[PDB]
Design an enzyme around this catalytic site. Structure first.
Site, PDB file in Angstrom:
ATOM      1  N   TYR A  30     -17.933  -0.751  -2.876  1.00 46.27           N
ATOM      2  CA  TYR A  30     -16.349  -0.692  -3.399  1.00 46.27           C
ATOM      3  C   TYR A  30     -16.665  -0.395  -5.076  1.00 46.27           C
ATOM      4  CZ  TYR A  30     -12.478  -2.737  -4.696  1.00 46.27           C
ATOM      5  OH  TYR A  30     -10.878  -2.887  -5.234  1.00 46.27           O
ATOM      6  N   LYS A  33     -14.709   2.837  -6.169  1.00 43.15           N
ATOM      7  CA  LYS A  33     -13.399   2.843  -7.208  1.00 43.15           C
ATOM      8  C   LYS A  33     -13.460   3.338  -8.228  1.00 43.15           C
ATOM      9  CE  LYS A  33     -10.447   0.546  -5.084  1.00 43.15           C
ATOM     10  NZ  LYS A  33      -9.519   0.995  -4.698  1.00 43.15           N
ATOM     11  N   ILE A  87       4.486   3.840  -0.169  1.00 43.30           N
ATOM     12  CA  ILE A  87       3.464   3.418  -0.598  1.00 43.30           C
ATOM     13  C   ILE A  87       2.700   2.711   0.598  1.00 43.30           C
ATOM     14  CG2 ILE A  87       3.086   0.948  -0.721  1.00 43.30           C
ATOM     15  CD1 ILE A  87       6.153   0.580  -2.078  1.00 43.30           C
TER      16      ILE A  87
HETATM   17  N1  LIG Z   1      -7.486  -8.059  -4.612  1.00 40.88           N
HETATM   18  C1  LIG Z   1      -8.153  -7.823  -5.487  1.00 40.88           C
HETATM   19  O1  LIG Z   1      -8.717  -8.454  -5.999  1.00 40.88           O
HETATM   20  C2  LIG Z   1      -7.903  -6.183  -5.577  1.00 40.88           C
HETATM   21  C3  LIG Z   1      -8.492  -6.068  -6.866  1.00 40.88           C
HETATM   22  C4  LIG Z   1      -8.243  -4.706  -7.587  1.00 40.88           C
HETATM   23  C5  LIG Z   1      -7.704  -4.133  -6.627  1.00 40.88           C
HETATM   24  N2  LIG Z   1      -7.183  -4.230  -5.670  1.00 40.88           N
HETATM   25  C6  LIG Z   1      -6.702  -3.062  -4.378  1.00 40.88           C
HETATM   26  O2  LIG Z   1      -5.393  -3.231  -4.369  1.00 40.88           O
HETATM   27  C7  LIG Z   1      -5.153  -2.181  -3.565  1.00 40.88           C
HETATM   28  C8  LIG Z   1      -4.536  -3.152  -2.796  1.00 40.88           C
HETATM   29  O3  LIG Z   1      -4.983  -4.406  -2.166  1.00 40.88           O
HETATM   30  P1  LIG Z   1      -4.312  -5.741  -1.897  1.00 40.88           P
HETATM   31  O4  LIG Z   1      -6.002  -6.866  -2.299  1.00 40.88           O
HETATM   32  O5  LIG Z   1      -3.438  -5.394  -1.708  1.00 40.88           O
HETATM   33  O6  LIG Z   1      -5.284  -5.367   0.050  1.00 40.88           O
HETATM   34  P2  LIG Z   1      -5.036  -5.801   1.372  1.00 40.88           P
HETATM   35  O7  LIG Z   1      -3.605  -7.641   1.231  1.00 40.88           O
HETATM   36  O8  LIG Z   1      -5.577  -6.518   1.851  1.00 40.88           O
HETATM   37  O9  LIG Z   1      -3.737  -5.230   1.449  1.00 40.88           O
HETATM   38  C9  LIG Z   1      -4.257  -3.624   1.896  1.00 40.88           C
HETATM   39  C10 LIG Z   1      -2.900  -3.141   2.710  1.00 40.88           C
HETATM   40  O10 LIG Z   1      -3.820  -1.743   2.863  1.00 40.88           O
HETATM   41  C11 LIG Z   1      -3.316  -1.418   3.985  1.00 40.88           C
HETATM   42  N3  LIG Z   1      -4.725  -0.618   4.962  1.00 40.88           N
HETATM   43  C12 LIG Z   1      -6.486  -0.420   4.794  1.00 40.88           C
HETATM   44  N4  LIG Z   1      -6.438   0.003   5.283  1.00 40.88           N
HETATM   45  C13 LIG Z   1      -5.649   1.139   5.708  1.00 40.88           C
HETATM   46  C14 LIG Z   1      -5.294   2.339   6.581  1.00 40.88           C
HETATM   47  N5  LIG Z   1      -6.743   2.620   6.798  1.00 40.88           N
HETATM   48  N6  LIG Z   1      -4.418   3.114   6.671  1.00 40.88           N
HETATM   49  C15 LIG Z   1      -3.220   2.473   6.541  1.00 40.88           C
HETATM   50  N7  LIG Z   1      -3.513   1.433   5.687  1.00 40.88           N
HETATM   51  C16 LIG Z   1      -4.415   0.317   5.831  1.00 40.88           C
HETATM   52  C17 LIG Z   1      -2.985  -2.642   5.029  1.00 40.88           C
HETATM   53  O11 LIG Z   1      -2.116  -2.728   6.180  1.00 40.88           O
HETATM   54  P3  LIG Z   1      -2.697  -2.595   7.965  1.00 40.88           P
HETATM   55  O12 LIG Z   1      -4.199  -3.580   8.385  1.00 40.88           O
HETATM   56  O13 LIG Z   1      -1.176  -3.578   8.694  1.00 40.88           O
HETATM   57  O14 LIG Z   1      -3.146  -1.047   7.928  1.00 40.88           O
HETATM   58  C18 LIG Z   1      -2.726  -3.885   4.256  1.00 40.88           C
HETATM   59  O15 LIG Z   1      -1.732  -3.949   3.943  1.00 40.88           O
HETATM   60  C19 LIG Z   1      -6.190  -1.954  -2.497  1.00 40.88           C
HETATM   61  O16 LIG Z   1      -6.639  -0.413  -3.056  1.00 40.88           O
HETATM   62  C20 LIG Z   1      -7.517  -2.764  -3.115  1.00 40.88           C
HETATM   63  O17 LIG Z   1      -8.646  -1.514  -3.582  1.00 40.88           O
HETATM   64  C21 LIG Z   1      -7.482  -5.109  -4.804  1.00 40.88           C
END
Ligand SMILES: NC(=O)c1ccc[n+]([C@@H]2O[C@H](COP(=O)([O-])OP(=O)(O)OC[C@H]3O[C@@H](n4cnc5c(N)ncnc54)[C@H](OP(=O)(O)O)[C@@H]3O)[C@@H](O)[C@H]2O)c1
Ligand SMILES: NC(=O)c1ccc[n+]([C@@H]2O[C@H](COP(=O)([O-])OP(=O)(O)OC[C@H]3O[C@@H](n4cnc5c(N)ncnc54)[C@H](OP(=O)(O)O)[C@@H]3O)[C@@H](O)[C@H]2O)c1
Ligand SMILES: NC(=O)c1ccc[n+]([C@@H]2O[C@H](COP(=O)([O-])OP(=O)(O)OC[C@H]3O[C@@H](n4cnc5c(N)ncnc54)[C@H](OP(=O)(O)O)[C@@H]3O)[C@@H](O)[C@H]2O)c1
Ligand SMILES: NC(=O)c1ccc[n+]([C@@H]2O[C@H](COP(=O)([O-])OP(=O)(O)OC[C@H]3O[C@@H](n4cnc5c(N)ncnc54)[C@H](OP(=O)(O)O)[C@@H]3O)[C@@H](O)[C@H]2O)c1
EC number: 1.1.1.-
Lengths: 268, 268, 268, 268
Positions: free
Chosen positions: B169, B173, B19
């Site tokens: 973004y 996507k 993950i």
């Molecule tokens: N929130 C929404 O409404 C939304 C909607 C549709 C899709 N998504 C997608 O869902 C996915 C997860 O999003 P989320 O909402 O859970 O975001 P989040 O809470 O900000 O978490 C994203 C995770 O990705 C990790 N990450 C970011 N850059 C990284 C890097 N360079 N190397 C390793 N790890 C990295 C971060 O961990 P660290 O900082 O510790 O590295 C964090 O744990 C993303 O692909 C996002 O585009 C989000």
């Protein structure tokens, strides 16, 4: 010289067009077609990496369209740091861009996922997407200042219908499409036109580049079909950009008659 | 502990899940949910940049699911050169990955084209697209050797319906989707499953990251709505990957009831 | 009997589901799956044209799930004028519908444009689109009165990727998708869930109907593949409708592992 | 009279066009534009229900384009049984159709699902979809016999991006698109061109029809915008059909500059 009728010529006259990937294929055809449609009466900024190809084009244009003004520019649009200065440093005469054609683009190889070289991933994305966006952001202020201008982005059928062995290229063209769509949605309060051109099979240097100069594999892509030629796509671009301002030929899919998708290609 | 029924737990048992973005939000929820659905009986490789967050998660898991095995890994997936070694150097026990969850991803700002920082462009694309592809290419050989495995990619509603102020973004996507679609088309002769998860509003650290730690702007995105929580998306991920092998929950759009698109969000 | 875990059973308990096309294939599977997931504790209204098939199903259910209550209804959903009365005349016990599954649907022939019988055009559109809409309009007031309810529409991969020889069917499934999307966008201010299920190859009576009872041609569609079975799609439907109310599994494409599109089907 | 240049006029000369919905709006504009682009040198079959409107148009054409030949036809394309005889009974001179423009179409009301009159549902589907397919099937043999001909279908932005209050219309235009796509995929082995025209806001009688003659509501749709006029769409149709035969302007989205989707419409 009025390949598209008088009214289209009037609308094009004296405008400045900036064309990326002007050294070959669609970009080159588009420079020529703009002159065919405007009786030579435009200003062209031709950018690509192969300077001699640009020079050769300018010379062709110079004798064919005496009244045309052409500024040739050796530029690797991949070199981000050079974009803004490139624009800011256009000779006074060419500074007032009216039409941006983000045509420079490529595909590298036909490898299935698992087999794709990291260099090929960076090169395709950097050229097709990142550079497209950089160039776009650098020109846009010109358009916003005068509340006019066309932004023309070369997508592909691959940008809406993905196919196996084309993951990176398709990902890149899907990206271009999406960026283009956001952009158009942002600009609805301006008179700036946002236009996406999406071709299928066009025989250019595209397949030659894609297969690293192997002419065999290149010609093989078009074997037993009559693909589009670069001037067919040029025709469409000049058509779209010569419509009256209020009209936006926003998104056009252009196919050779034998093709209906990346998966539906009749070979005679 | 069988949040999804006996049969799903049977199918998940003893599998190894990798993950990305496990330190927060959906990735973190997904690690936990996998355990809820399998009675703790899986092996998790949790990767992200914040090592303490990972450690904390592992500790939580250790006491909650004694029979689970968790390998924590501090990794910035943006550092391409570290990906292949990362996979090759997994401890023997975790080497046989069964499920890859390409979850790590982000959005930076809500700037209209013309106002977008080049760093923000590179970071979003490198994390969302390039790294996702690199990580996918590095793991895929494991799956091809054993003709099994799930590839789970986090897309977004933004991946099929672009919106103004989200050009980068959305572009990223759309690219993830297209890459995913190519991939699935390439693998139809294997039993490797290719799954795209596309959420709308989920309240995680996603908006916090998006607005550079400004909690105000973050909470504001969800104001007067009941968004999805990360465990809702986790639920779907575990659901998709716990179906019998022959079944591919290929592409799922998940919404909070008040949302129908990026442009159709009811606020009570 | 809790095929999907305890929480899902709790959420389904005592709800009333109305299923069109209950006499066979997906509709029939779905009635059975609802009971598997809820420990028999629901109310089913099973509608289709073949009354004996319905009776047979009810008998099966009666002995397998003593605590289930099943109302069988012989209905040709193509007979518009009977729809509203049908709903209004449900026995008191079944009047309070919670979930509508618009599953009844068909395809007729694989003729190319030019060769398509007008009867086949009307039948497919009337069953797949018009009737779906009529039934939807007739039930919706129930859902709006109580501000809850799930509307489940059976689309198809054909509803987003059209294919030659399937023009009418694809047209009908594109229409179902579009209608479904408008609907979801209209209801964002309610807690009414709008869910689109889009399968690829499922072996039911679908191909048998499509080729007018010719078993040869029917079996041939699945030759050398492992298609989805009706319970696979039933599993997804029950999954979507047993999520907590705020979550909408809005749009799901489900494929057998050998299929990636109507054009990408691996045959072993 | 060569609104689109000499080469386009050459390609159009002496061809026979059949236009549905010729009595007003885009259909009417298209008849006129065909003559503007061909120096009057074509044969037009103008069909719609309002015979006087057709007569009036013919009279206009007769004096404006002496060398044009116009066959006027009172036809309600909704009366299926009359389609085949209509084609078979065209006067000798007009029997050899080259271009079919399936333009007749409408929307009725802006009711939300639950409030939609069954008459409005049948009328929209029968005119926009069923009739379009019937007319298409009846003309196609002409094209197949000579392996040439253009099929032009009026879709809409509503055919790819649905919106609340437009469920039926959108459903109908999604269906027209899908049918169109299947058709183009079937014909890749012929030189028959399949062309989809998809406009946004065009000010015609379209909104007047939609709101049952209420001029207020009609003008209100365009208030504070500069929509496309019918001749704008006519321009695109004539453009597409006057390309060299090998070229297919397959699918074009045309917008007024202030519009980027059904949801993104700037009002000044
Ligand atoms: N929130 C929404 O409404 C939304 C909607 C549709 C899709 N998504 C997608 O869902 C996915 C997860 O999003 P989320 O909402 O859970 O975001 P989040 O809470 O900000 O978490 C994203 C995770 O990705 C990790 N990450 C970011 N850059 C990284 C890097 N360079 N190397 C390793 N790890 C990295 C971060 O961990 P660290 O900082 O510790 O590295 C964090 O744990 C993303 O692909 C996002 O585009 C989000
Ligand atoms: N042709 C097709 O079948 C096909 C189909 C659909 C869409 N398209 C798209 O249409 C566009 C034009 O393609 P084409 O067929 O005309 O290709 P082409 O014949 O190979 O020409 C591409 C042009 O782009 C220039 N270019 C490449 N990288 C550059 C860079 N880093 N900086 C500046 N210029 C660069 C090249 O010139 P230099 O090498 O001299 O720099 C060349 O002139 C591309 O975006 C392509 O994706 C192509
Ligand atoms: N199977 C696939 O590969 C596939 C793929 C994608 C989507 N789908 C869709 O999934 C849904 C069901 O498919 P299926 O495979 O289960 O088909 P199926 O095995 O033929 O069953 C369809 C059901 O609908 C009923 N029905 C048909 N016409 C009706 C009418 N006019 N009035 C009332 N009931 C009617 C039939 O019962 P009676 O004859 O007794 O009335 C039958 O129970 C359809 O919407 C279909 O388009 C199927
Ligand atoms: N206007 C827009 O914003 C817009 C946008 C996208 C797509 N479109 C499509 O463009 C096409 C033309 O629309 P428009 O704006 O030109 O509409 P319009 O001005 O109202 O004209 C529609 C034409 O269709 C004819 N017609 C309607 N029903 C008919 C029937 N049953 N049999 C024969 N003819 C019939 C009408 O003639 P009679 O009443 O004399 O029969 C009229 O000539 C339609 O397909 C529409 O859906 C319009």
């Amino acid at each position: 010289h009025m390949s598209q009728g008088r009214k289209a010529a009037e609308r094009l006259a004296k405008k400045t067009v900036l064309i990326t990937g002007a050294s070959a294929g669609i970009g080159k055809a588009t420079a020529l077609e703009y002159l065919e449609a405007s009786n030579g009466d435009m200003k062209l900024i031709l950018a690509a990496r192969r300077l001699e190809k640009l020079e050769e084009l300018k010379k062709t244009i110079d004798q064919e369209f005496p009244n045309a003004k052409v500024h040739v520019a050796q530029l690797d649009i991949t070199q981000a740091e050079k974009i803004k200065p490139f624009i800011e440093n256009l000779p006074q005469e060419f500074k007032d861009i009216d039409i941006l054609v983000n045509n420079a683009g490529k595909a590298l190889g036909s490898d299935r996922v698992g087999q794709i070289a990291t260099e090929d991933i960076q090169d395709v994305f950097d050229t097709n997407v990142t550079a497209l966006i950089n160039i776009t952001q650098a020109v846009l202020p010109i358009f916003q200042a005068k509340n006019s201008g066309d932004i023309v982005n070369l997508g592909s059928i691959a940008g809406r219908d993905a196919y196996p062995t084309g993951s990176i290229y398709c990902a890149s063209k899907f990206a271009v499409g999406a960026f283009t769509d956001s952009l158009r949605k942002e600009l609805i309060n301006t008179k700036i036109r946002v236009i996406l051109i999406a071709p299928g099979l066009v025989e250019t240097e595209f397949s030659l580049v894609r297969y690293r100069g192997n002419e065999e594999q290149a010609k093989n892509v078009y074997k037993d079909t009559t693909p589009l030629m670069a001037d067919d796509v040029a025709d469409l671009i000049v058509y779209a950009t010569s419509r009256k301002q209020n009209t936006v030929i926003a998104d056009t899919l252009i196919f050779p008659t034998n093709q209906a998708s990346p998966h539906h290609i009749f070979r005679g």
